């Protein structure tokens, strides 16, 4: 059973695909978001993404369809590699740590309108060992996913 805070966080994530704020992800919004993140999605690959999550035949994913997607069961092994896959999406320069610049790169692709101060406070709060970057452990930790690391 998800708290309001966990639903809210999913919703804020939903909001980054739904740029026109219609309350749905269309196929063209999905395509723009996947390219930006560096996956090279194909027109037909997008049709399958859309069809598999939209359960009411609208051709769009609303927050409730997205919310099933983002709360479906997953084993611990699958979930670890999930966090890991996401950490490596950031690590662009393959250095083993998430730097200010990684984050700035990723916030921009998702269309976050963040200042450097706001990015630095995001770096600052995860850091922990005071090195100015975010390693694997402290990544797991700020995601509130400690027992997986």
């Amino acid at each position: 059973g998800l708290t309001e805070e966990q639903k809210q966080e999913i919703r804020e994530a939903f909001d980054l695909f739904d740029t026109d704020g219609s309350g749905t992800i269309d196929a063209k919004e999905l395509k723009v978001a996947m390219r930006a993140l560096g996956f090279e999605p194909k027109k037909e690959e997008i049709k399958k993404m859309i069809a598999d999550i939209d359960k009411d035949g609208s051709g769009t994913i609303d927050f409730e369809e997205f919310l099933q997607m983002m709360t479906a069961k997953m084993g611990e092994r699958d979930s670890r590699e999930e966090i890991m896959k996401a950490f490596r999406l950031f690590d662009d320069d393959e250095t083993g740590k998430i730097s200010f610049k990684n984050l700035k790169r990723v916030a921009k692709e998702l269309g976050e309108n963040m200042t450097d101060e706001e990015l630095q406070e995001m770096i600052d709060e995860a850091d922990r060992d005071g090195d100015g970057e975010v390693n694997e452990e402290e990544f797991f930790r700020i995601m509130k996913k400690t027992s997986l690391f």
């Binding site: 994530a13 980054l16 695909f17 598999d52 997607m69 996401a86």
Partner: peptide, 22 residues
Amino acid sequence: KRRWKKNFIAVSAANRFKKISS
């Protein structure tokens, strides 16, 4: 806090959609 997790959930979603395609 929420910013970190928000990014996580968006990038996790990207990763799920990619998984669906293949």
